[PDB]
Design a protein around this ligand. Structure first.
Ligand SMILES: Nc1nc2c(ncn2[C@@H]2O[C@H](COP(=O)(O)OP(=O)(O)O)[C@@H](O)[C@H]2O)c(=O)[nH]1
Ligand SMILES: Nc1nc2c(ncn2[C@@H]2O[C@H](COP(=O)(O)OP(=O)(O)O)[C@@H](O)[C@H]2O)c(=O)[nH]1
Lengths: 173, 332, 337, 172
């Protein structure tokens, strides 16, 4: 039995503390906390000790969580599908961070808030957001040279398990 | 509430391995992480200069008491004396709060409470105001790189020079609080134990960690740490940190002739001055990860989050201060 | 005062058990297992007579034990599952489940807890037997446990009804002891064998058992029944030593002429089964002690030690019933000569 | 350097109560003593003390399986107001220790010092006989152990001594 340390990184507001909470418990809130969580999972017969790590809040202070990158087996890199800014930052900001702190460690690319992305109403109502299309994700995924791109939504739970399965797959293989 | 304390402490005894087998982490690092995750969670919502909502303040208060309690019990077990009403002296062993926890815990709580208060000094009228990030008025308004925060605005054409006097008075009040916390954070990590893993990863000799260029410099006849540094590339934070890591490794080797060691230590001090906001070093990251001592775990972990709050708040003051500078400028 | 009280207990467990901060103490599991065993010891150490556990000691036992056991509510199996919405969209999820060995056992051990306590409640009110102050004249005139208060009985012995009543109660209680002990054994058997223990194991099966014992479990014939009848089982120490040499051997075998070691192992496990049958109340073996000393699973720590204290409480209560029953016998005899 | 100090003895002998008094300077007016460790300074060097209670292991042999494992020193307590606890030390305790934990040193302790020369107490409890400090010694020299101390949790007389003594036989 291996150990997988799986850190989720991304901008603020892109919603990970929710993806993590929802994967782990099948809920969706409203404070909002994901304490470090580890548990045994069986993948294809052999059993695996999976560790889930949130980075919420270190978008603000570089020294807040010194433990995020140390020995990480895989990243989940999330951007919000209703935010062109988080889309641009994957490239401009996150890839250099990971290239530096944990070189050669796999990245699962994930777009969040699937459920808002073709909500015509939501965008007239929040003029500043911009939907990212699945193509643009795919395109981005190739660009940063990550193995797989999943879109998901912690409100509906769509593809959430998919993501972590993919994080696990890539560490094992 | 007892129902809700129970959940909290119980998950710390697992630590954090949800599947029994305490294969898994230390009550220390369970603690450290939990303090971190709580603070992150709570101040993640301080997105504006205003009092922490009263319900939040309440929750932060109790859960932080909970996490801090183990320290009430960490002691020194020390011989002593006591004499009776009748006059007989009796040798006893007495108990007392362990050294670093007696002064620092109170000290850290007073900083916590000072942060919370500076935010209370925002209860009621503020000559500045926030617009939601996704609404039209937002799109017209340092900001573009943190797309998630609400854009602050200040009245067209400056803001009152009382309202700006005060914000400076608070940018300073808070910077001094930040520095205090960091000073405690610093102290603990230096009194933390050097991990067996870290030693193991160390090179053969001083000239391997510093490598031969830098080795010649801490090794010639003259030396003055000020010049030493003016001769190296310190353009980036990554570069300064790579040096810090090389100096630290050497020191740790030599404490297991002493001239170098003394100079090496003189150089680190100079770094901590010139480069105060520096991310933590390979050794600190390691001290923390393999640390088994819950006394220090609570100490370093708690000073760390306070460091961060103070910084969050002074960013929120710099946010307004500077969209103020921009207001005077676009008045041209 | 309670939320206060509880913090203290829990805080001390995170410390574990090293009050000097450095977490150079024991694992959480051990800290937990220890506090359960000490709690029980102090509470039941006053159960000195056949009577209702006092109302407020019933109360402290209940909530303290509650605090201690709660960790189990958070120990889980994290398994795949499925989930469908009001609209019909099936979505794949990870789901959470109390771990297998706590799902049934924890409720079962708690069910014995309450049966013991209420066995003791059936002694509310008149009892034909009474207890006397240990250092009184009455007391002076099983004298072994000198610290308990002596029972006395009516000069003519007990009455069929209060005697039938007591036997029925001895039987009830010894089944609870059998039960608890059975859980205690399951879990010990499902607990990791400590690197410490292996390191100290001899090279060969021959070395564990000894040449003589080796020759025995190794011949063509073998009836484990006669095997034991051939040995010296006269004292509890001798039986325990045999148990140990057997357990060690099985460990060696499981770890590793070729074919027939399956047999030896089959037999060795057969002989351990018999030992539980013949010698139901043996103390812990060496590999039991070690499993406990070095165990890191919070879940098993709670299971192992809860069952252990329950086993004990039950045994303590029969020990009382047997005290009256015995002096009642002395009452009949001394009333016949 | 670590010391595992178990203290054993009869029931009702004062034990769990000594311990509580060494460690917190209180009495009982439930008495519980959880497993305790603390750092101690002895002649400049620092030892890590481990204190173990046995209360119980006088109603069920199977109750405390870890008492004797790796024990570094025993405190063998008997109540100075109990002839039976005195008699038992030889009839029962020495044979245990000699088997479960051979060669591990034994500090002998008479507890309940405050009650021994109390004349009115024995009028009130005729079934008690006070043990003499001599009989104490005699026992000591007999059970073959290095140190005999008499103490009282109540007064707190000689309690620190007992432990200092326990610590010493391990360090030398
Ligand atoms: N509508 C919607 N909102 C989401 C979803 N996932 C997260 N959010 C929102 O994301 C906001 C903050 O996300 P959060 O979980 O805190 O991510 P984080 O702050 O980066 O850790 C919250 O207001 C959530 O409502 C989703 O699937 N749908
Ligand atoms: N006078 C006096 N009474 C004591 C002393 N120690 C204990 N006692 C009383 O005698 C009994 C001691 O029992 P305890 O402390 O529980 O020892 P244990 O049962 O062997 O663990 C309790 O009733 C105490 O109140 C002592 O040093 N002096």
């Amino acid at each position: 039995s291996r150990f997988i340390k799986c850190v989720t990184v991304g901008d603020g507001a892109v919603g990970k503390t929710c993806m993590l909470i929802s994967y782990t418990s099948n809920t969706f809130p409203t404070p909002t906390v994901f304490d470090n969580f580890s548990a045994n999972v069986v993948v294809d017969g052999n059993t695996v000790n999976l560790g889930l790590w949130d980075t919420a809040g270190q978008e603000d202070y570089n020294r807040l969580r010194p433990l995020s990158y140390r020995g990480a087996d895989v990243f989940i890199l999330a951007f919000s599908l209703i935010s062109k800014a988080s889309y641009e930052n994957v490239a401009k900001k996150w890839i250099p961070e990971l290239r530096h702190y944990a070189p050669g460690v796999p990245i699962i690319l994930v777009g969040t808030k699937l459920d808002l992305r073709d909500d015509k109403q939501f965008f007239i109502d929040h003029p500043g957001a911009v939907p990212i299309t699945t193509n643009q994700g795919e395109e981005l995924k190739k660009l940063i040279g990550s193995p797989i791109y999943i879109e998901c939504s912690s409100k509906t739970q769509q593809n959430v398990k998919a993501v972590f399965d993919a994080a696990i797959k890539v560490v094992l293989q | 509430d007892m129902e809700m304390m129970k959940d909290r402490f119980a998950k710390l005894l697992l630590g954090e391995d949800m599947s029994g087998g305490g294969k898994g982490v230390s009550s220390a690092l369970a603690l450290s992480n939990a303090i971190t995750n709580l603070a992150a969670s709570i101040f993640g919502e301080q997105t504006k200069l205003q009092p922490m909502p009263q319900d939040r303040q309440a929750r932060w208060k109790k859960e932080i008491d909970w996490l801090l309690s183990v320290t009430d019990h960490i002691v020194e077990f020390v011989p002593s004396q006591q004499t009776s009403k009748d006059g007989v002296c009796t040798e006893i062993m007495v108990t007392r709060q362990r050294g670093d926890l007696l002064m620092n815990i109170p000290a850290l709580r007073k900083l916590d409470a000072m942060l919370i208060d500076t935010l209370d000094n925002f209860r009621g009228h503020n000559e500045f105001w926030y617009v939601s990030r996704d609404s039209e008025e937002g799109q017209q308004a340092r900001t573009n790189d943190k797309w998630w925060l609400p854009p602050v605005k200040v009245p067209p054409g400056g803001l009152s020079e009382p309202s700006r006097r005060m914000l400076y008075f608070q940018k300073d009040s808070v910077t001094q609080v930040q520095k205090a916390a960091m000073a405690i954070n610093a102290q603990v990590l230096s009194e933390m134990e050097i991990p067996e893993s870290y030693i193991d990863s160390l090179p053969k000799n001083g000239r391997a960690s510093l490598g031969d260029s830098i080795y010649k410099s801490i090794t010639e006849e003259w030396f003055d740490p000020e010049q030493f540094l003016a001769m190296l590339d310190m353009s980036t934070e990554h570069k300064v940190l790579d040096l810090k890591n090389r100096i630290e490794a050497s020191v740790v080797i030599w404490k297991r002739r002493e001239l170098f060691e003394e100079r090496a230590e003189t150089i680190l001090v100079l770094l901590k001055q010139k480069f105060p906001g520096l991310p933590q070093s390979s050794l600190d990251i390691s001290k923390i990860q393999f640390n088994k001592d819950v006394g220090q775990a609570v100490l370093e972990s708690y000073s760390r989050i306070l460091e961060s709050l103070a910084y969050t708040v002074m960013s929120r003051i710099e946010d307004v201060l500077y969209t103020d500078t921009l207001a005077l400028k676009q008045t041209l």
